[PDB]
């Protein structure tokens, strides 16, 4: 049998990768972050409450002018808010009520959403006729869609639940790079600030760094024990932090190819649905299933505050690009801007 | 105390509020029916008699609008999008009776895995199940030719269709962990037989009765 000896050269390849990243491992991040001082108990209050959603929130994405945000829900509604004056700017009726993700374009021209009909639809917000229309309706996946995030106004990467991330081009509609390599059902996606790299996580407890332009899996991180649910990418470009169903968040790192910090607490029995980072990256903010967001001193792993404001499970979460505010959506269908 | 631009923005958000409220009060009156079951269970035939990605079917019957979500084309992990289907009114499980001895591992054993997995699920603990039992004529000319004891070796019975069909019905009914909350409805039909929407209507009007007590605080 040649395939059993070939999988044991794969096994010894796993042995060189693991003792390489353990031979390069000298100090846990807590062992040098003892000399920094903690932020301590900080309080963030519900500055705004954004009601108008009736079924459960599944995603949210802040604008790059840090004032607008979009939110997708189970009732077939994509709603763009002014978060300042609580004003609803647009309300987009979806063709599929089952949507699991949304994004807002970096130029602000577009929103995406996608769900259980396996299509990330692209919506044109700035329209000469006034109403939001569907620009390009991207059907190329065989499984449900778990994240789709804009790179430019013309490039969008799309996680899906058929082991396949996919880089698209929105004039053509055809995927230009298909990212394969996951074993089951990719859940999340987070772009780099220079937009040359992205990460993704899946049911095989593996987080993989991808390269956008050339198209192969640059790195792979296996630290979790269950389904990774959502992922977030640190603002420096050099790290990312992810979140899974075993109530644990992990801070990995791209240039060192390993794990740095573990963000679990024994009082949490239930998984994460979203993570995002602060402007400095000092706060990691994790949504949860015990109905409240936690805040994490992202260098010290403390539980420095809890954004308990929701009746049901927090789905989604996000910080503005100037770091001014945190919006958290949830299954009781109430976006709360925090500050 | 604000400008006329911000005053017309508040009026824009108010009419967006009115349109969302009337859309949600429209959409809380249709009946959502999650159709599950294996692929060769005759589910296309029941779509033509109740009438890629997820498949949605629309039909109305006696002033009640139904929404049927055939989700068999989602060949992925069930857990994520099965938590996205709580709050559904009733579940239409479909088991073909003819596939007791027919190969894929046997098909009744996989159907009992699916039925046990959706009855014991956390997200379906108050959900009525309208279990259909399909292709009964092929069960007739498969039980007059071959015994069911190939499928169920711990079954000793009369080996006619009535007693063996009641036996596999009770093996499907016994898969609950909790029999006091969920209420499983079971029907026998074939492709020729006509009135099969009425059994669905009776099961959903019983769970509309229970939800109308929950609306009125009782």
């Amino acid at each position: 049998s040649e395939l059993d000896q070939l999988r044991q050269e794969a096994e010894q390849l796993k042995n060189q990768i693991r003792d390489a990243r353990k031979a390069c491992a000298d100090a846990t991040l807590s062992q040098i972050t003892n000399n920094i001082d903690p932020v301590g108990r900080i309080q963030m209050r519900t500055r705004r409450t954004l009601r108008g959603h009736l079924a459960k929130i599944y995603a949210m994405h802040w604008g790059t002018d840090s004032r607008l945000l979009v939110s997708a829900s189970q009732d077939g509604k994509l709603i763009i808010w002014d978060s300042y004056t609580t004003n609803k700017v647009h309300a987009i009726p979806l063709r599929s009520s089952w949507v699991m993700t949304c994004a807002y374009a970096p130029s602000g021209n577009y929103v995406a959403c996608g769900g259980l009909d396996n299509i990330c639809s692209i919506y044109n917000l700035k329209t000469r006729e006034g109403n939001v229309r569907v620009s390009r309706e991207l059907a190329g996946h065989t499984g449900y869609l778990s994240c789709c995030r804009f790179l430019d106004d013309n490039q969008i990467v799309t996680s899906s639940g058929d082991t396949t991330c996919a880089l698209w081009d929105i004039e053509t509609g055809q995927q230009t790079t298909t990212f394969t390599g996951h074993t089951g059902d990719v859940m999340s996606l987070s772009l780099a600030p220079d937009t040359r790299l992205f990460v993704s996580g899946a049911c095989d407890a593996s987080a993989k760094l991808w390269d956008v332009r050339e198209g192969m899996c640059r790195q792979t991180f296996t630290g979790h024990e269950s389904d990774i649910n959502a992922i977030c990418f640190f603002p420096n470009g050099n790290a990312f932090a992810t979140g899974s169903d075993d109530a644990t968040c992990r801070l990995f790192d791209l240039r060192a190819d390993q794990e740095l910090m573990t963000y679990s607490h024994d009082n949490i029995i239930c998984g994460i649905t979203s993570v995002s980072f602060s402007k400095s990256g000092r706060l990691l903010l994790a949504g949860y299933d015990d109905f409240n967001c936690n805040v994490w001193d992202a260098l010290k792993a403390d539980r420095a505050g809890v954004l308990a404001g929701h009746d049901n499970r927090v789905s989604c979460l996000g910080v503005t690009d100037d770091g001014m505010a945190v919006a958290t959506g949830s299954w009781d269908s109430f976006l709360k801007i925090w500050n | 105390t604000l400008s006329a631009e911000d005053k017309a923005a508040v009026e824009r958000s108010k009419m967006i509020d009115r349109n969302l409220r009337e859309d949600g009060e429209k959409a809380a009156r249709e009946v959502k029916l999650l159709l599950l079951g294996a692929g060769e269970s005759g589910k296309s035939t029941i779509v033509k008699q109740m009438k890629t990605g997820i498949v949605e079917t629309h039909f109305t019957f006696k002033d009640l609008h139904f929404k049927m979500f055939d989700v068999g084309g989602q060949r992925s992990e069930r857990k994520k999008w099965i938590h996205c289907f709580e709050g559904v009114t009733a579940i239409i499980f479909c088991v073909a009776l003819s596939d007791y001895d027919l190969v894929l591992m046997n098909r009744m054993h996989e159907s009992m895995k699916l039925f046990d997995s959706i009855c014991n699920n956390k997200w379906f603990t108050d959900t009525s199940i309208i279990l259909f039992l399909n292709k009964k004529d092929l069960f007739e000319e498969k039980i007059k030719k071959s015994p069911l004891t190939i499928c169920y070796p711990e079954y000793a019975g009369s080996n006619t269709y009535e007693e063996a069909a009641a036996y596999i019905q009770c093996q499907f009914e016994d898969l609950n962990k909790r029999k006091d909350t969920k209420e499983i409805y079971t029907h026998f039909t074939c492709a020729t037989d006509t009135k099969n929407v009425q059994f669905v209507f009776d099961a959903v009007t019983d769970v509309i009765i229970k939800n109308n007590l929950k609306d009125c605080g009782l």
Partner: single-chain antibody
Amino acid sequence: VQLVESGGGLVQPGGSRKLSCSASGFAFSSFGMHWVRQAPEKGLEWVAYISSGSGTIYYADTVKGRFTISRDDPKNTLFLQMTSLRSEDTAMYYCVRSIYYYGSSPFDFWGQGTTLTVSGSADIVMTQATSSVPVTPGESVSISCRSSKSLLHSNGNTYLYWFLQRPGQSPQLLIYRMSNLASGVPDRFSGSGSGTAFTLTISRLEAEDVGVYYCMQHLEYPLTFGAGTKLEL
């Protein structure tokens, strides 16, 4: 997007005319609507405003309660109905749309126009520096307009507009809210200033910039214009 107005002509003094503007080709039921008129040799003057879905109607403080506006959504037609037409009511009526959310461009697209001939203390007034400017093509042009009370509101948005009526043509929008430039207009234009002290900086004038430039405040109603600057060669 087309907004073809209808009606107009000549009418007796004391008469009535239902002046119409039928919209076509866009999502009319979510746009606030206006009418802005002008004299045959003076600047623009505002008529009325109805918001989308008929929620709010303001009127001119010149004529309030005599003019009446009406909005039809299934036919996408706006009417203006007018009663007892005085000697002031020989003017050039225009059918303006706008939309008001965050990031919107109010007062962008304008109707074709109709003519109809017939035989104030707390209002912020706009005063322009001139009425005619001779400047050759190629070099930088500055057009300044005055306000009587400061246009910066505490949110930050400074409600000063810059239109352009080409000679013989309908107005367009150049700069909405004092510094933000409307799409469909080339990026040579800019405008800046602090409160009441504002200038329209035009760089690299070619032959399409001839025409009369207008400045409008929108802190409150009425919507008062300046005289306008005729640019010619």
